[PDB]
Amino acid sequence: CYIVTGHSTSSSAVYKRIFNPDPNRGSDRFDVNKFPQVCPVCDLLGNMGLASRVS
RNA sequence: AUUGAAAGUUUUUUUUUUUUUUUUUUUUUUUUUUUUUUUUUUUUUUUU
């Protein structure tokens, strides 16, 4: 799950071609009792309010 | 209807004066407002 999306303010077609874009995919929500399950990457690295098993 | 009677025991006099329920007697002696809690996590100084 992508962590930060925001809005598209600049275009870099080289990035869009080298790496496959996926605008459909959303983002992880939180680590509170509401929606505690997260994407594996968010669980590994970190998320808002969930720390990083890694540094 | 008496031997036969008609007389207030009355007038007058303050139970009054002297004397602070008073002196001494600290509602104090002791008791730490402490005690467990990371201002922490998420974010590539960056493109036509």
In this structure, how many other beta carbons lie within 10 angstroms of the beta carbon of residue A47? 20
What six digits make up the tokens of A27?
């983002």
Question: How many other CB atoms sit within 10 Å of the CB of residue A42?
Answer: 20
**A2/A10 Cα distance (integer angstroms):** 18
Amino acid type, A32: V
End-to-end CA distance of chain A: 20
A5-CA/B43-C1' distance, Å: 11
CA distance A37 to A27: 12
- Strand B footprint at Cβ < 7 Å? A 3-4, 10-15, 45-52
> Which tokens is A10 given?
């600049």
Method used experimentally? cryo-EM
Q: How far is the CA of A25 from the C1' of B46 (A)?
A: 24
Resolution of the experimental model in angstroms, please? Answer: 3.5
